[PDB]
Design an enzyme around this catalytic site. Structure first.
Site, PDB file in Angstrom:
ATOM      1  N   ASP A   1      87.774  60.417  67.716  1.00  0.00           N
ATOM      2  CA  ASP A   1      88.901  59.506  67.638  1.00  0.00           C
ATOM      3  C   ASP A   1      90.174  60.330  67.675  1.00  0.00           C
ATOM      4  O   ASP A   1      90.570  60.884  66.666  1.00  0.00           O
ATOM      5  CB  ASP A   1      88.830  58.710  66.338  1.00  0.00           C
ATOM      6  CG  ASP A   1      89.989  57.732  66.173  1.00  0.00           C
ATOM      7  OD1 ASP A   1      90.965  57.758  66.940  1.00  0.00           O
ATOM      8  OD2 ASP A   1      89.935  56.917  65.252  1.00  0.00           O
TER       9      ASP A   1
ATOM     10  N   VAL B   1      85.822  54.330  64.687  1.00  0.00           N
ATOM     11  CA  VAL B   1      85.577  55.695  64.224  1.00  0.00           C
ATOM     12  C   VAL B   1      86.487  55.980  63.043  1.00  0.00           C
ATOM     13  O   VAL B   1      87.702  55.677  63.083  1.00  0.00           O
ATOM     14  CB  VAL B   1      85.864  56.770  65.301  1.00  0.00           C
ATOM     15  CG1 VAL B   1      85.671  58.186  64.726  1.00  0.00           C
ATOM     16  CG2 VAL B   1      84.969  56.569  66.485  1.00  0.00           C
TER      17      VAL B   1
ATOM     18  N   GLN C   1     103.372  45.917  61.188  1.00  0.00           N
ATOM     19  CA  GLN C   1     104.509  45.039  61.359  1.00  0.00           C
ATOM     20  C   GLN C   1     104.055  43.598  61.226  1.00  0.00           C
ATOM     21  O   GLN C   1     104.863  42.738  60.931  1.00  0.00           O
ATOM     22  CB  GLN C   1     105.160  45.232  62.723  1.00  0.00           C
ATOM     23  CG  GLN C   1     106.541  44.605  62.802  1.00  0.00           C
ATOM     24  CD  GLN C   1     107.137  44.675  64.185  1.00  0.00           C
ATOM     25  OE1 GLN C   1     108.191  44.110  64.437  1.00  0.00           O
ATOM     26  NE2 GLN C   1     106.462  45.359  65.088  1.00  0.00           N
TER      27      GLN C   1
ATOM     28  N   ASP D   1      92.640  53.398  60.823  1.00  0.00           N
ATOM     29  CA  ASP D   1      91.371  53.175  60.124  1.00  0.00           C
ATOM     30  C   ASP D   1      91.403  51.783  59.472  1.00  0.00           C
ATOM     31  O   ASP D   1      90.343  51.178  59.227  1.00  0.00           O
ATOM     32  CB  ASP D   1      91.164  54.204  58.987  1.00  0.00           C
ATOM     33  CG  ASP D   1      90.954  55.630  59.494  1.00  0.00           C
ATOM     34  OD1 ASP D   1      90.469  55.794  60.624  1.00  0.00           O
ATOM     35  OD2 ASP D   1      91.280  56.586  58.769  1.00  0.00           O
TER      36      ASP D   1
ATOM     37  N   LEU E   1     102.868  46.617  65.707  1.00  0.00           N
ATOM     38  CA  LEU E   1     103.579  47.165  66.865  1.00  0.00           C
ATOM     39  C   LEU E   1     102.592  47.578  67.943  1.00  0.00           C
ATOM     40  O   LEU E   1     101.530  48.103  67.627  1.00  0.00           O
ATOM     41  CB  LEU E   1     104.402  48.386  66.430  1.00  0.00           C
ATOM     42  CG  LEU E   1     105.335  49.143  67.385  1.00  0.00           C
ATOM     43  CD1 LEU E   1     106.657  48.429  67.531  1.00  0.00           C
ATOM     44  CD2 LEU E   1     105.603  50.496  66.779  1.00  0.00           C
TER      45      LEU E   1
ATOM     46  N   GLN F   1      90.037  51.020  63.671  1.00  0.00           N
ATOM     47  CA  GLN F   1      90.394  51.636  64.964  1.00  0.00           C
ATOM     48  C   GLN F   1      90.102  53.082  65.484  1.00  0.00           C
ATOM     49  O   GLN F   1      90.016  54.089  64.820  1.00  0.00           O
ATOM     50  CB  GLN F   1      91.727  51.142  65.529  1.00  0.00           C
ATOM     51  CG  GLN F   1      91.686  49.720  66.091  1.00  0.00           C
ATOM     52  CD  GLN F   1      91.009  49.492  67.468  1.00  0.00           C
ATOM     53  OE1 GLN F   1      91.195  48.416  68.008  1.00  0.00           O
ATOM     54  NE2 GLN F   1      90.246  50.459  68.023  1.00  0.00           N
TER      55      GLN F   1
ATOM     56  N   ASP G   1      84.721  51.649  54.490  1.00  0.00           N
ATOM     57  CA  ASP G   1      84.439  50.753  55.597  1.00  0.00           C
ATOM     58  C   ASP G   1      85.509  49.654  55.592  1.00  0.00           C
ATOM     59  O   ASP G   1      85.444  48.753  54.777  1.00  0.00           O
ATOM     60  CB  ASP G   1      83.054  50.134  55.375  1.00  0.00           C
ATOM     61  CG  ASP G   1      82.670  49.122  56.438  1.00  0.00           C
ATOM     62  OD1 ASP G   1      83.454  48.883  57.372  1.00  0.00           O
ATOM     63  OD2 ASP G   1      81.558  48.566  56.335  1.00  0.00           O
TER      64      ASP G   1
HETATM   65 CA   LIG Z   1      90.039  56.206  62.956  1.00  0.00          CA
END
Ligand SMILES: [Ca+2]
Length: 320
Positions: free
Chosen positions: A242, A296, A88, A288, A17, A292, A303
């Site tokens: 973030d 961060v 999505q 994450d 989305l 994103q 990771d």
């Molecule tokens: Ca993050």
């Protein structure tokens, strides 16, 4: 090891989305993931679909993805593709695998709401409180514009209300009735299904994982608190660098209060299970998962780029 992620079939990344391939044509949705896969030998394409739309329907993202898969195959001469979708996007991937089974070798969903999101139910319920109904009209107008504005190609095919509806738990149950998969467990069981499916005589490898950064902690007066396990308490730099970090802990507190259990701020562990579940333990919030807010993440989060890379090689070893 430059052929480490070199799968036989091209990898197509499918966004969720609000997405597009590059926000405002500048910020990559899958932050740093395409270059990494490519430097390890993968052939990767990033779909650019409507950020706001249902997945099925003539105007849906599903039909958009199918058209893109086809142009990717025609362009490369490949016969099948590996579909990896976030949010999505995993629902859109299921649409293609069901509709054109011969063109797909595998479906991997990352934090996908196969059973919808309690947060979407929440938002829809709120919108539905306006007796005049203007709220829907005005908010939708604003979100569709934001869609057209941020889409890499200024896609005008945006329908904020269709997208919101399709992410609700009630709607997602109908979707599953409509496009079943041997990879899904029984509705209401919080269990996954089989690791593969054979449609049209074509076999698909099915995989999934989810982030469960948001854990419920204590309940009092019928109120349940939650913790964000991805970070070091109060002090984590990710809380500062973030802004999605704290924002998803908050939406994640709403969900825990709607009985969703562990989640990533927007999707519960139970809704995310599909095919062969590689892990539901990642200390990641919803963003994450795609590395994103410019890569961060809290000190305890894994990771996500390494996780995706390792999966590309697992696909290679599986023969796809
Ligand atoms: Ca993050």
């Amino acid at each position: 090891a430059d052929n480490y992620a070199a799968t036989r079939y091209p990898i197509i990344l499918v966004h969720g989305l609000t997405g597009t391939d590059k926000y405002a044509g500048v910020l990559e949705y899958w932050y740093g993931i395409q270059e990494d896969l490519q430097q390890r030998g993968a052939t990767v394409y990033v779909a650019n679909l409507s950020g706001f739309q249902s997945d099925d329907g003539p105007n849906g993202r599903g039909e958009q993805l199918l058209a893109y898969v086809k142009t990717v195959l025609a362009a490369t001469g490949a016969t099948k593709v590996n579909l990896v979708g976030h949010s999505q996007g995993g629902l859109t991937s299921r649409y293609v695998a069901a509709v054109a089974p011969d063109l797909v070798a595998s479906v991997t969903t990352i934090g996908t709401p196969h059973r919808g999101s309690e947060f979407a139910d929440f938002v829809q319920g709120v919108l539905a409180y306006d007796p005049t109904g203007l709220s829907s009209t005005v908010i939708a107008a604003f979100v569709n514009v934001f869609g057209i504005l941020t889409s890499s190609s200024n896609n005008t095919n945006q329908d904020a209300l269709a997208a919101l509806k399709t992410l609700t738990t009630a709607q997602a149950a109908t979707y599953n009735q409509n496009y079943p998969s041997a990879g899904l467990g029984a509705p209401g069981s919080c269990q996954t299904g089989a690791p593969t499916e054979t449609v049209g005589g074509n076999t698909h490898l099915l995989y999934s994982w989810a982030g469960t950064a948001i854990q419920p902690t204590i309940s009092v007066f019928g109120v349940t608190g939650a913790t964000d396990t991805s970070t070091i308490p109060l002090v984590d730099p990710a809380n500062a660098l973030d802004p999605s970090t704290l924002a998803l802990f908050g939406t994640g507190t709403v969900m825990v209060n709607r009985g969703s259990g562990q989640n990533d701020g927007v999707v519960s562990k139970c809704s995310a299970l599909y095919g062969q579940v590689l892990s539901t333990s990642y200390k990641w919030n919803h963003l994450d998962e795609i590395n994103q807010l410019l890569g961060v993440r809290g000190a305890n989060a894994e990771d996500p780029v390494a996780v995706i890379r390792t999966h590309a090689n697992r696909l290679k070893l599986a023969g796809v």
